[PDB]
Every structure is written in structure tokens, then in C-alpha cells.
């Protein structure tokens, strides 16, 4: 296991880069009551989703890498938490992008139509949806539907490809919650670019979209190769998982730090 | 006419020249320094949302009142970081605040030219306005309670006035300044007071008969703050020329000049300690220097504020000092 | 821990904090416009000490602080208005022949406002008042009595456009603020329409700078 | 400032009755409210309490579960809902307002009062009845089990005066403090365990029953009663 | 002409007041701080038992 060893260690350092920044953000909001407004609410929801990656996802992402012999329903529930809070980070990125889209489409009415009550309802809605997308295989979409042999096997080894269905990853993980948000986020940022003109501001929108694409698209096409009967090496399969968690460590860098109000406090 | 007043200006000058035989530095060069004063923030009051412009302590050295530009007067329990009262204001433009010696009243004022007195101990339990004073034509700068019945106010129409809370009309008017009067300070015996103005001159007034006794000059810029010594025989002024100066009511001249070469910005608030050994001045470089008033040495820096320091005040027992600033934060230092 | 009365004192302090943030978003929702310039004509048709006028238009609440009654020094209270959206500045056009020159006193006031530390980020709306009386005055007297370097025709369109270009020439840090220039009409109500259109562009930039885009 | 309690009267033990009071003359939403029960020819008993904004609600252990207390701030009406009544609950019910901040005087006003027909600090009065001639200074002793001195430095004991035929009146709200509207002849001193109230002059208005109350920890317990006679 | 009535006799009433020497006048400022140096908590840091902050 000359490759698995370097994977596990790098998951912690990226892992602990993530958890320091997001905890910092939550305090900064609570220390400054001028920052307790509409704008910073969405940044709190992105920060809390990335804290849950640091304390839940990061221990559980190592467990499935060692293949420890555990119960089938225990290994599926451990991988169920790998999808609740990573998809919660993606849905929080869409909530910020629609929040910036209301700023250029509503104008004057933005501070009147959007109410503090409505922000919790919509943030909570996104969080709720994310919880259910991570809890789909346990209610009848488990791997046992593919073969009758897997129903008799109990106390197997915990491998992500052995418990999680290749089907769910390509059509419900990728096409509904990775592909549809990406095409929307491209359409929002393009529409902001046309209304700000009627190179310094063009790179601000392009960088935000570039890091989202770099973190989730190399892993998404690995699931397409395995489903199309291909074979992938594990040198790049481990690097895809790393990049899939690197989105949490760059969220306070690209969203909180660019805010000039935060830029003074920190 | 003017030639008779000009020759007696030299009559003030040569008597003052013969009065100064030595300096304060030549007396205090043979004493020990107080040392590098390092003091930290013990409490931070985070309730406000706009710039803090005025802050006054209480007589029991626990309750303080802070005035800000969002239209809120908040009474703070500085021991437990609590909000005893929150008083909404009729005009959001507030530049001064005051606390009664009995603790039953507070005052506020600003660009509305109106000094409002709020009652704190009423039967109904909510803070309500007790007396509305409106006789000035210039913006209110500083107000200080004498007791529950009379208050002295500073205004921007080059006048100071003495009021009466019960009648609601001023009894004495203090005239003679040419610049905008920016500050007040009440003496420990509450018989006489000073006022710093924008004519680079501060004048000492009598409360009883209402006449200016002495006139002090020396600054090359407008004065923003004033405070008596705890002895009551001296006071200090803070101006916009990055220079603090100390006066004596008996010597009637300059004694010490608190300035540094690297300080350029002006001074907003100046207060003394309990013993008068430490002078605390709030500058506009986002920090607050502590000046040893007998040695003209910066013995400590208070650099915990994001924006400029606008108001500061020391407790009656000398236990703590609170600093207000434009970043909506009150910080109690000890 | 705490006693039975200290727990209720902290609970009282928490109930105040939910009323401070309730009033904080109420005040930040409304828009503040400082009204400078020597003024009284624009406020009577849209509707001692500082006089503030509260009015609403198209579901937006405006407030205009008229500080024309302040006869004191402007330096001691101009930093109290740094958290505003736009300074409404009024220039009369019929005082160029009247006299110190009354027209040149407006440019001295305009130079001090734009070069302030506290008004660098804040936009400035410029109103050129009494445009009807300037048309009769420019026919009887030339504009060259004020400016010896005056060039071009003496017609009303060229003279009014000539005054405007020096007013924007006094602006420094042109990337930060934008000066909106309007000619006042006494009969029509288009003056308050220009204020709403100008303040919409500022708060869009204010909303975009909160998130970090623009 | 007045409190008029509505409701009350005859009721079966199987019945349930609702008690409410009318608050006027003060900012009702900023004041916490209490219900205090006075049994016939017995001491005062605390029932329930609501904080400001209905944040924290406490109950007495004997009436917990059976009793419900609620308030309506726009209505300025405080409600008590009683669902199960025994033969012990037949008593006079008073409503008390109280506000809590630094230097505050809680329990400062008492209602008129309507009639209805384990680890607690026990307050005991050493004397049942002391007949006092006017002009002679006396001390009324209140004895506690647990020490009322707290870490922040103020002892939480409250002195009340029951004039015959009227509502209770607060005289002294904490030790070395005096309430408003009370003359300067009332003076109190305290210790770790034993507390006393030292009056100097006596008049016709000073006769009655004196109750000491504690506010250190819920539930609040009153004194037995020190009657004075003429 | 208004300064002839007010400003003329105002400054001469400020002229004929007694002044002590500044060596003696600043000695009272020096001696006041030495007399109260033990009672100023901002100069000498008090222990945290009696300190409320
Ligand atoms: N093909 C895969 N093999 C192993 N783990 C995967 C795969 N696809 C997704 N995951 C896991 O799911 C998480 C996000 O769904 C990833 O960070 C990773 O832990």
C-alpha cells in the first residue's frame, strides 16, 4: 500500500486547512453585529456545511479506504454521511449564486422583497434536500438490487464501490445535483457579466466558477468510466477524492476574503 | 480704541514672563518614570451599530452611558456586560452625553440644538424624557450635570450656558468666545468650570456670577477636549495640532507640552486618572496614547480599536477606563 | 454561576438585543441623502438646527438632511454624514452676474466637498437650479465676465454645457464616484425622478460591493 | 398603576376555573409577573412566574402540571389557568410585578387580590405575635436555613408588610436598601444566616404582619408571619 | 464700536489678579500625585481578588 499511505495523510492536512477557516468565519459574524445582515447569512450556511465535512466526512473517508470488515448496513450508513454534507456544500454554492443574481435583477426591491425570515426558509430548504440525497440507498436503493448473491452476504468488507451503486452516482448524483447546478451557475455568471457592462471584474466571476468545476468534474467522469465497463487506476482515483474535498478549504478564500467588510476585520 | 487694548496685551505678557521662573520639566527631571504601562481589554461592549461619539461614566463606577449616531442611548452594566436600558432618541445626530451624579438622569444633544433630559427612576419602568432644553443656536458639544436641578452645556454659537431643569430656562449665559466651543469640564468642588473652543483659547468661567476669570492661549489650532486635574487647580487641553498642553489656574500660563514628532493627527478626547499622574488622550491614528502628565512621556499605547477614538473616560475610583470609537465598540481597559 | 435575578438580567439584555438588530435593519433599509449647497427651491416642490424631511417614493423611503441653517464651521460636523448615499448639491445659474462672485463661491464649496476624506466613495448628485432665469441673463450679458478664457457661442445650449464641464473637472478619483448632473425644472416633477434613478445605480454598486463582485 | 384580578368564586373540586388580572398604568411587557397565594390565616405562598417576553416560566412544586400561567402583552392581561383544584387551593390570589436589572427593586407592587372558595429554603419567624406600644423601637427576626449571600455580593431577602384589610407592601427589597414610597424609619441589617428589620418609630399605619421572602433560588418561600398588636 | 464697551474692561479685570510663581504652582501638581500614588489602580496593578475586571 505504497499509494494509500500518502492519500490518508494528505486528507488530514487539507482536512484541517478547511476546519480552521470556517470556524474563524462563524466567530467573525458573531463578533461584529454590523456583519449580521442578509449578505453574510449565506456565508454562514457555506461555513457550517464545510465544518461538517471536517468533523464527519474526514474521519469517515479514511474508514472506507482501509476496507475494515463491518456490517453491511453500518458501512452503508457511514457512506451515507459522505453524501449528506458534501452535497450540502454544493447546494450552498448555488444559494450564494442565486443571492448575487437577485442583487442585479431586483434592484431597489432587494432589501424589501428578501426578508430575514425568508433566508432561513430557503437555506433550510437546501440543507433538507441535501440530507435526503445522502440518505437514498438505505431506503431500497442499496446494492442488493443488482445481484441475489449480495443479499446472503453479511459482515463483508467496506469498500465504497462495493456498497454504493454505480447507477445512482451517474444519474442522480451527477446529472441532477452536479450537472444542473453547473449549467445554472454558468448561466447566472454569464448574465451578471452582461448587466455589469450596461478585466478586473471578469476574473472575479471566472475564478469562482473555475474552482467548482475543478473540484467535482474529474471525479464525476471517473464514475462514468466505471459505469461504461472501463477500468481506472487508483493513483488518479485517490486524487479525485482529494479534489472533491478541496472545495471546502477554498470556500473562505474565494467567498469571505473577497468581501471588503470581512477584509478589514480579519 | 483698539490701541488701548493692544498695549495691555503686553501687560499680560510681561507679568506672565516674570511669573515663569522655571518649567515643569526642570522640577520633575529628578523623579522616577512611571514605567511602560501595559493594560488590556477586559470587556467589549458590542451592542452599537454606528459611530460612538460620547461616553460618560457613573458615580458608582459601574454604569456608563454611550451615545451613538444610530439614535440609541444605551446604559451598560460594565461588570457583567449587560444592557440596563436602551433609550431611543428623537434626533440621531448626537455629539454629547451626560450622567447625573444621583444616577436618576441622563442628557444628550447634538446637531438638533436641543438638550434632552431623560428620567431613569420613574414609576412606569420605561425611560422617558423629563425636560427639553432648547435655547441655543449652535450645535451641542458637551454637557455636564451639576446636580438634579442645574446643568451646564456647551454649544457651537461661541457661547456656554447654565440651565435650570425645573423651570426649563437658562439662568446664566457665558459669552466672550470667538470660536466654536467644543468641550466642558466641571471642577471637583463644582464652583467653576473651563471650556475649550475653536479660537485656540480656553477660558475659565464662574458658575455663580457668570464671568470669565482667566484666559489661556498657546495652541496654534482648535481645541477639541478639556478636563480638569483631580486636584481642581489645573486642566489640560487636546487640540488638532497633535499636541496636548497643561495649564495652571494659579500660574496662568503653559506648564508642559505633550507632543511627539511621529504624531500628526488630531486629538478628540482627553481625561486624567484618579491621582492625575496619567493623562489619557484619544488620537485619530486608530489608537490611544497614555501620557505621563508630569514627564511628557508616552508611557502606554491603547491600540485595540479599528477606527478613530472619539470618546474616553476614567472611573471615579480609577478602577477602569472605557474607550469609544467609530467602529461601534466600547472597550473597558484595566 | 448566576443568581435568580442575574439570570433575568441577562435575559433582559437579550431582549434588548433583538430590538437593536430589528431597528438596525429598519434604519439601513432607508436611504440617506445629505443636502448641501446654498436649496430651498428643490424641497418645497418634491414634498433652527438640522432639518430632515422624510418622504417615500416607489416603495423607497428617502430622508434629506438640510444643513443650511448651520451657521457654524462645517469641518466639525461634516464627518457625521460619511455614511450617506449621495450628496445633493444645488447650484444657482442666475447669480453669475451678481456679486466676491456668487458663482465662484459655489466652486469653492464644490472643491472642498469632493476632496474630503469622508466623501471619497460617496457619489455626488449635482443640481443646476434656475435654468430658466439663466436663459434671459445670457442674452443680455455674456458669460465671459466670470471666465476670461470663455470660448464658443453665447447661446443658451453652449453656455449651460460650458458651466457643466468645469464642475466635473474639479472631481478627483473619478473611478470611485460619479457626478450626476441635472437641470432643475420647477413646473415638472422630473427632479425627484432623477434622484430615484441616480440612487438606484449607487445601491446596486453598494449591493455588489457587499458580496465582492463590483 | 393598579392590578385588578378578575375571576374567582365558588367552584367544585372537579371543576376548573381561569384566573386573570388587568394591568394598567405601566409598561406591562417589560415587567415580569408573579402569582402569590395567601391561605386564610396562614403565610404567603408563591405559585408561578413569567419573565419578560415569556422566555422562562417557573412553577411551584405543589401546583406544577395542574396549573398553567400565560400572558398577552398587547392585551395587557395576565392569565392563570387552573385545571385541578383541591381543598387546599381555596385561598386569596395576588398578582405581583417585578423587573430585574442592576439596582432594580423587584416585587415593588402587589395586586388587590381575588378570593377562591425537599430542597427548598425554609423561612421561619421566631415570634408569632409581639404586642408593641408606639414609640418603642423593636427588631423583627427572620431566620433562614441556607445562607443568602451570593458570590456577586448582595443578599437576596425581601421584607413585606401586610396591613390588615389591604394588599402587601414592599418595604425593603435587599439588605441595606429601601424601597420608594417607604419612610426612613424602616431600616434593615443582614448577616450570613440571621436577618433582622429594625424600625424606630411606630404609628397606626405600621401595625400588621411582617413577611420575609427570599429570591436566591426558585421556588420562593415566605416567612411564617410576625404579627404586631396595639 | 461694541468692543469699546465690553472688551476694554474685560481684559483689565483679568489683569489685576494675583499669580503665584510657577515653581510653587507646579510643586502642588507634583505633590498631589505623590500623595495619591498608592490609591490609583491604573499605576499599580491590583491583584485579581478585589479586581472586578
Ligand atoms: N468512485 C468513487 N470511489 C470511492 N469513493 C467515491 C467515489 N465517488 C465518490 N466517492 C466518495 O464520495 C464523496 C462525495 O460523494 C467523495 O469525497 C468520496 O469520498
Cβ distance of A37 and C212 shorter than 8 Å: no
**CA-A223 nearest atom, ligand 1:** 1
> Are D103 and D163 in a shared domain?
no
- Note the residue count of chain C: 214
Phi/psi region, residue B286 (left: phi>0; alpha: psi -120 to 50; beta: rest), is: left
> Are D52 and D97 in a shared domain?
yes
> Are D6 and D31 in a shared domain?
yes
Strand partners, C88: C35, C125
- CB of B68 less than 8 A from some CB of A: no
E neighbour chains, 3+ CB pairs within 8 Å: B
As a three-state string, the secondary structure of chain D is: CEEEEECCCCCCCCCCEEEEEEEECCCHHHCEEEEEEECCCCCEEEEEEECCCCCCEEECCCCECCEEEEEECCCCEEEEEECCCCCCCCCEEEEEEECCCCCCCCCCEECCCEECCCCCCCCEECCCEEECCCCCCEEEEEECCCCCECCCCCECEEEEEECCCCCEEEEECCCCCCCCCCCCCEEEECCCCEEEEEECCCCHHHCCEEEEEECCCCCCEECCCEEEEC
Can you read off the three cell numbers belonging to residue B119?
Answer: 428620567
Query: What residue segments make up the domains of chain A, in order of their start?
Result: 4-265
Can you read off the three cell numbers belonging to residue B149?
Answer: 436641578
**What is B215-259 written as a DSSP string?**
EEE--SS-EEEEEE-TTSSEEEEEESSSEEEEEETTT-SEEEEEE
In whole angstroms, how large is the CA radius of gyration of chain E?
A: 22
CATH assignment of A4-265, given 1.10.10.60, 1.20.210.10, 1.20.1070.10, 3.40.50.800? Answer: 1.20.1070.10
Task: Decide: helix, strand or coil at residue B74.
Answer: strand
Can you read off the three cell numbers belonging to residue C85?
Answer: 448615499
Q: How many domains does chain D have?
A: 2
CA distance C133 to C125: 22
In short, whether A87's Cβ falls inside 6 Å of ligand 1 is: no
- CB of C3 less than 8 A from some CB of B: no
Q: For residue A27, how many other CB atoms are within 10 A of its CB?
A: 9
CA distance B330 to A166: 58
- CB of B84 less than 8 A from some CB of D: yes
**CA-A169 nearest atom, ligand 1:** 8
User: Could you tell me which of D151, B103, B68, C169 has the C-alpha nearest to residue A34?
Assistant: B68
The secondary element (H helix, E strand) that includes residue C63 is strand C61-66
Range of the domain at D73: 2-117
CA distance B91 to B78: 26
CA distance A236 to A228: 18
**What is chain E written as a DSSP string?**
-HHHHTHHHHHHHHHSS----HHHHHHHHHHHHHHTGGG-TTTSPPPTTT---
CA distance B211 to A194: 70
CB B325 within 8 A of CB B54: no
Task: Decide: helix, strand or coil at residue B63.
Answer: strand
Q: State the nearest Cα–Cα gap between A217 and chain C, in angstroms.
A: 25
Query: What residue segments make up the domains of chain C, in order of their start?
Result: 27-199
Which residue in B59, B125, B126 has the most chain D C-beta atoms within 10 A of its own C-beta, making it the best mutation to test that interface? B125
C-alpha of residue A8 to centroid of ligand 1, in Å: 14
User: Could you tell me which of B266, B256, B279 has the C-alpha nearest to residue B221?
Assistant: B266
Q: Which residues contact C149 (CB under 8 A, 6 or more apart)?
A: none
Strand partners, B54: B67
CA distances for D198 relative to D125, D186, D201, D226, angstroms: 15, 7, 10, 13
Domains and CATH numbers, chain B: 1-333 (2.130.10.10)
Q: Would strands B159-162 and B172-175 be described as parallel, antiparallel, or unpaired?
A: antiparallel
CB crowding D71-85: b at 16 or more within 10 Å, else e = beeeebebbbebeeb
Pure H helices in A160-228: 160-163, 166-168, 180-197, 202-227
CA distance B86 to B100: 17
Q: Residue C83 class from Cβ within 10 Å (0-12 exposed, 13-18 middle, 19+ buried)?
A: middle
Phi/psi region, residue D165 (left: phi>0; alpha: psi -120 to 50; beta: rest), is: left
CA distance B55 to B66: 4
> Are D108 and D18 in a shared domain?
yes
CA distances for E28 relative to B248, B277, E34, E35, angstroms: 10, 13, 10, 10
CA distance D209 to D164: 8
Q: For residue C89, how many other CB atoms are within 10 A of its CB?
A: 24
Strands in B234-239's sheet, in edge-to-edge order, are B223-228, B234-239, B243-248, B254-259
- Dihedral of the CA atoms B88, B89, B95, B97 (nearest 10)? -60
As a three-state string, the secondary structure of A102-170 is: HHHHCHHHHHHHCCHHHHHHHHHHHHHHHHHHCCCHHHCCCHHHCCCHHHHCCCCECCHHHHCCHHHHH
CA distances for D76 relative to B124, C7, C9, D24, D93, angstroms: 14, 24, 22, 7, 19
Q: For residue D164, how many other CB atoms are within 10 A of its CB?
A: 8
Can you read off the three cell numbers belonging to residue B319?
Answer: 478602577
CA distance A46 to A33: 19
In short, whether A28's Cβ falls inside 6 Å of ligand 1 is: no
- Pick the residue whose CA is nearest to atom 10 on ligand 1: A241
C-alpha of residue E12 to centroid of ligand 1, in Å: 93
Rounded to whole angstroms, the maximal C-alpha distance in chain B is: 63
User: Could you tell me which of D105, D110, D85, D151 has the C-alpha nearest to residue D23?
Assistant: D110
Q: Would strands C123-129 and C179-183 be described as parallel, antiparallel, or unpaired?
A: parallel
CA distance A202 to D129: 89
∠ CA B256-B257-B263, nearest 5°, is 155
C-alpha of residue D25 to centroid of ligand 1, in Å: 67
CA distance C88 to C194: 11
Would you say the C-alpha torsion E41, E45, E49, E53 has a positive or negative sign? positive
User: Could you tell me which of B77, B76, B78 has the C-alpha nearest to residue B67?
Assistant: B76
Residues of C (12-51) whose Cβ lies below 8 Å from D: 12, 15
Task: Decide: helix, strand or coil at residue B164.
Answer: coil
> Are D161 and D134 in a shared domain?
yes
The secondary element (H helix, E strand) that includes residue A41 is helix A38-52
∠ CA B323-B329-C1, nearest 5°, is 95
In this structure, what CATH number is given to the domain that contains residue D188?
Answer: 2.60.40.10
Residues of A (31-90) whose Cβ lies below 8 Å from B: 31-34
User: Could you tell me which of C58, C131, C52, C122 has the C-alpha nearest to residue C90?
Assistant: C131
The secondary element (H helix, E strand) that includes residue B84 is strand B82-88
CB D109 within 8 A of CB D84: no
- Dihedral of the CA atoms C153, C156, C158, C163 (nearest 10)? 120
CATH-assigned architecture of domain C27-199: 3-Layer(aba) Sandwich (3.40)
CA distances for D203 relative to B193, D61, D137, D141, D183, angstroms: 48, 39, 11, 20, 12
CA distance D139 to A241: 81
CA distances for B205 relative to B152, B211, B215, D155, E47, angstroms: 11, 6, 9, 46, 42
- Note the residue count of chain A: 266
Q: Residue D170 class from Cβ within 10 Å (0-12 exposed, 13-18 middle, 19+ buried)?
A: buried
CA distance D27 to B184: 36
Nearest CB to B82 within list D1, D102, D180? D102
Place of cell 475494515: A68
Place of cell 470660448: C151
CB crowding B280-290: b at 16 or more within 10 Å, else e = bbbbbebbbbb
Place of cell 448615499: C85
Strand partners, B77: B63, B82
- Pick the residue whose CA is nearest to atom 4 on ligand 1: A160
CA distance B164 to C193: 48
> Are D111 and D131 in a shared domain?
no
Q: Which residues contact D77 (CB under 8 A, 6 or more apart)?
A: D20, D21, D22, D23, D71
CA distance A256 to C24: 22
Task: Decide: helix, strand or coil at residue B141.
Answer: coil
CA distances for A266 relative to A252, A259, B42, B48, C12, angstroms: 12, 11, 21, 20, 31
User: Could you tell me which of B57, B106, B103 has the C-alpha nearest to residue D103?
Assistant: B103
Among D82, D117, D152, residue at a domain's last position: D117
Helices and strands, number each (H, E), in chain C: 6, 6
The DSSP output letter for C67 is -
Pure H helices in chain B: 2-19, 24-28
> Are D113 and D128 in a shared domain?
no
Q: How many CA atoms lie within 13 A of D195 on its CB side?
A: 31
CA distances for A185 relative to A51, A181, A256, D182, angstroms: 24, 6, 19, 72
CA distance C67 to C80: 12
Q: Which residues contact D109 (CB under 8 A, 6 or more apart)?
A: D1, D3, D96, D97, D170
The DSSP output letter for C78 is G
CA distance C211 to A52: 24
> Are D216 and D150 in a shared domain?
yes
Chain E residues inside the 8 Å CB shell of B2: 3
Strand partners, B291: B279, B298
**Pocket of ligand 1, candidates A167, A241, A249: which has the most ligand atoms within 8 Å of its Cβ, to mutate?**
A241
CA distances for D174 relative to B125, B167, D64, D150, D160, angstroms: 19, 36, 28, 12, 11
**Which experimental method was this entry solved with?**
cryo-EM
Q: For residue A164, how many other CB atoms are within 10 A of its CB?
A: 23
Can you read off the three cell numbers belonging to residue B266?
Answer: 488630531
Place of cell 423587573: D99
Range of the domain at E7: 1-53
Q: How many CA atoms lie within 13 A of A193 on its CB side?
A: 14
Amino acid at each position: 500500500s505504497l499509494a494509500n499511505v500518502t492519500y490518508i495523510t494528505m486528507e488530514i492536512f487539507i482536512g484541517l486547512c478547511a476546519i480552521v477557516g470556517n470556524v474563524l468565519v462563524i466567530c467573525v459574524v458573531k463578533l461584529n453585529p454590523s456583519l449580521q445582515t442578509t449578505t453574510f447569512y449565506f456565508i454562514v450556511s457555506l461555513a457550517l456545511a464545510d465544518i461538517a465535512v471536517g468533523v464527519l466526512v474526514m474521519p469517515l473517508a479514511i474508514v472506507v479506504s482501509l476496507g475494515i470488515t463491518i456490517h453491511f448496513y453500518s458501512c452503508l450508513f457511514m457512506t451515507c454521511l459522505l453524501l449528506i454534507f458534501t452535497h450540502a456544500s454544493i447546494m450552498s454554492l448555488l444559494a450564494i449564486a442565486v443571492d448575487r443574481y437577485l442583487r442585479v435583477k431586483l434592484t431597489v426591491r432587494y432589501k424589501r422583497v428578501t426578508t430575514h425570515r425568508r433566508i432561513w426558509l430557503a437555506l433550510g430548504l437546501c440543507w433538507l434536500v441535501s440530507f435526503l440525497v445522502g440518505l437514498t440507498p438505505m431506503f431500497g436503493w442499496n446494492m442488493k438490487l443488482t445481484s441475489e448473491y449480495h443479499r446472503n452476504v453479511t459482515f463483508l468488507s467496506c469498500q465504497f464501490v462495493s456498497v454504493m451503486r454505480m447507477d445512482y452516482m451517474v444519474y442522480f448524483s451527477f446529472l441532477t445535483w452536479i450537472f444542473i447546478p453547473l449549467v445554472v451557475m454558468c448561466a447566472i455568471y454569464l448574465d451578471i457579466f452582461y448587466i455589469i457592462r450596461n478585466f478586473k471584474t471578469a476574473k472575479s466571476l471566472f475564478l469562482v466558477l473555475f474552482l467548482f468545476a475543478l473540484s467535482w468534474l474529474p471525479l464525476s467522469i471517473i464514475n462514468c468510466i466505471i459505469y461504461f465497463n472501463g477500468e481506472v487506476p487508483q493513483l488518479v482515483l485517490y486524487m479525485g477524492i482529494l479534489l472533491s474535498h478541496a472545495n471546502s478549504m477554498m470556500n473562505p478564500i474565494v467567498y469571505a476574503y473577497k468581501i471588503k467588510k470581512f477584509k478589514e476585520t480579519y | 480704541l483698539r490701541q488701548e487694548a493692544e498695549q495691555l496685551k503686553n501687560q499680560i505678557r510681561d507679568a506672565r514672563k516674570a511669573c515663569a521662573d522655571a518649567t515643569l520639566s526642570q522640577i520633575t527631571n529628578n523623579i522616577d518614570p512611571v514605567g511602560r504601562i501595559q493594560m488590556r481589554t477586559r470587556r467589549t461592549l458590542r451592542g452599537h451599530l454606528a459611530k460612538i461619539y460620547a461616553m460618560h461614566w457613573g458615580t458608582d463606577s459601574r454604569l456608563l452611558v454611550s451615545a451613538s449616531q444610530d439614535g440609541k442611548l444605551i446604559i451598560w452594566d460594565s461588570y457583567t456586560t449587560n444592557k440596563v436600558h436602551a433609550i431611543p432618541l428623537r434626533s440621531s445626530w448626537v455629539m454629547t452625553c451626560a450622567y447625573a451624579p444621583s444616577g436618576n438622569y441622563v442628557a444628550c444633544g447634538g446637531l438638533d440644538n436641543i438638550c434632552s433630559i431623560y428620567n431613569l427612576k420613574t414609576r412606569e419602568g420605561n425611560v422617558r424624557v423629563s425636560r427639553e432644553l432648547a435655547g441655543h443656536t449652535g450645535y451641542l458639544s458637551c454637557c455636564r450635570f451639576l446636580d438634579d436641578n442645574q446643568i451646564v452645556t456647551s454649544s457651537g454659537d461661541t457661547t456656554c450656558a447654565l440651565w435650570d431643569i425645573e423651570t426649563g430656562q437658562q439662568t446664566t449665559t457665558f459669552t466672550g468666545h470667538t470660536g466654536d466651543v467644543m468641550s466642558l469640564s466641571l471642577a471637583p468642588d463644582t464652583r467653576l468650570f473651563v471650556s475649550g473652543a475653536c479660537d485656540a483659547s480656553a477660558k475659565l468661567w464662574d458658575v455663580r456670577e457668570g464671568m470669565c476669570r482667566q484666559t489661556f492661549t498657546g495652541h496654534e489650532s482648535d481645541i477639541n477636549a478639556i478636563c480638569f486635574f483631580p486636584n481642581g487647580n489645573a486642566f489640560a487641553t487636546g487640540s488638532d495640532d497633535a499636541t496636548c498642553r497643561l495649564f495652571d489656574l494659579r500660574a496662568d500660563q503653559e506648564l508642559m507640552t505633550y507632543s511627539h514628532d511621529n504624531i500628526i493627527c488630531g486629538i478628540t478626547s482627553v481625561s486624567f486618572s484618579k491621582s492625575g499622574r496619567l493623562l489619557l488622550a484619544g488620537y485619530d491614528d486608530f489608537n490611544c496614547n497614555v501620557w505621563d502628565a508630569l514627564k511628557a512621556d508616552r508611557a502606554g499605547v491603547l491600540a485595540g480599536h479599528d477606527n478613530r477614538v472619539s470618546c474616553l473616560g476614567v472611573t471615579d475610583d480609577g478602577m477602569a477606563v472605557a474607550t469609544g470609537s467609530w467602529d461601534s465598540f466600547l472597550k473597558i481597559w484595566n | 454561576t448566576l443568581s435568580a435575578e442575574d439570570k433575568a438580567a441577562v435575559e433582559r439584555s437579550k431582549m434588548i438585543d433583538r430590538n437593536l438588530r430589528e431597528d438596525g435593519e429598519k434604519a439601513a433599509r432607508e436611504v440617506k441623502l445629505l443636502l448641501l449647497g446654498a436649496k430651498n427651491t428643490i424641497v418645497k416642490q418634491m414634498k433652527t438646527g438640522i432639518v430632515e424631511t422624510h418622504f417615500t417614493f416607489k416603495d423607497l423611503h428617502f430622508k434629506m438632511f438640510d444643513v443650511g441653517a448651520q451657521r457654524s464651521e462645517r469641518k466639525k460636523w461634516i464627518h457625521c454624514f460619511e455614511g450617506v448615499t449621495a450628496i445633493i448639491f444645488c447650484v444657482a445659474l442666475s447669480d453669475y452676474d451678481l456679486v466676491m462672485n456668487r458663482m465662484h463661491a459655489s466652486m469653492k464649496l464644490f472643491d472642498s466637498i469632493c476632496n474630503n476624506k469622508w466623501f471619497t466613495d460617496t457619489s455626488i448628485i449635482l443640481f443646476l437650479n434656475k435654468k430658466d432665469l439663466f436663459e434671459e441673463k445670457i442674452k443680455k450679458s455674456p458669460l465671459t465676465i466670470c471666465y476670461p478664457e470663455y470660448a464658443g457661442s453665447n447661446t443658451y445650449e453652449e453656455a449651460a454645457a460650458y458651466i457643466q464641464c468645469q464642475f466635473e473637472d474639479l472631481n478627483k478619483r473619478k473611478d470611485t464616484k460619479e457626478i450626476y448632473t441635472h437641470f432643475t425644472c420647477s413646473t415638472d416633477t422630473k427632479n425627484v425622478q432623477f434622484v430615484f434613478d441616480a440612487v438606484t445605480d449607487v445601491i446596486i454598486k453598494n449591493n455588489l460591493k457587499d458580496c465582492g463582485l463590483f | 398603576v393598579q392590578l385588578v384580578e378578575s375571576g374567582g368564586g365558588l367552584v367544585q373540586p372537579g371543576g376548573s376555573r381561569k384566573l386573570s388580572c388587568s394591568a394598567s398604568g405601566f409598561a406591562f411587557s417589560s415587567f415580569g409577573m408573579h402569582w402569590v397565594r395567601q391561605a386564610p390565616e396562614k403565610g404567603l405562598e408563591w405559585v408561578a412566574y413569567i419573565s419578560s417576553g415569556s422566555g422562562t416560566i417557573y412553577y411551584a412544586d405543589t401546583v406544577k402540571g395542574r396549573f398553567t400561567i400565560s400572558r398577552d402583552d398587547p392585551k395587557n392581561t395576565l392569565f392563570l389557568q387552573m385545571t385541578s383544584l383541591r381543598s387546599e387551593d381555596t385561598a386569596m390570589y395576588y398578582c405581583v410585578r417585578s423587573i430585574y436589572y442592576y439596582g432594580s427593586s423587584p416585587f415593588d407592587f402587589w395586586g388587590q387580590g381575588t378570593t377562591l372558595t425537599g430542597s427548598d429554603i425554609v423561612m421561619t419567624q421566631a415570634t408569632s405575635s409581639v404586642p408593641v406600644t408606639p414609640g418603642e423601637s423593636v427588631s423583627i427576626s427572620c431566620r433562614s436555613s441556607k445562607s443568602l449571600l451570593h458570590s456577586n455580593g448582595n443578599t437576596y431577602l425581601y421584607w413585606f408588610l401586610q396591613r390588615p384589610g389591604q394588599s402587601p407592601q414592599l418595604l425593603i427589597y435587599r439588605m441595606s436598601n429601601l424601597a420608594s414610597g417607604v419612610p426612613d424609619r424602616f431600616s434593615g441589617s443582614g448577616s450570613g444566616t440571621a436577618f433582622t428589620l429594625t424600625i424606630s418609630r411606630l404609628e397606626a399605619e405600621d401595625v400588621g404582619v411582617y413577611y420575609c421572602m427570599q429570591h436566591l433560588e426558585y421556588p420562593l418561600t415566605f416567612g411564617a408571619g410576625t404579627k404586631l398588636e396595639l | 464700536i461694541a468692543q469699546a464697551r465690553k472688551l476694554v474692561e474685560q481684559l483689565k479685570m483679568e489683569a489685576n489678579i494675583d499669580r503665584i510663581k510657577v515653581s510653587k504652582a507646579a510643586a502642588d501638581l507634583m505633590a498631589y500625585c505623590e500623595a495619591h500614588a498608592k490609591e490609583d489602580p491604573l499605576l499599580t496593578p491590583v491583584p485579581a481578588s478585589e479586581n472586578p475586571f
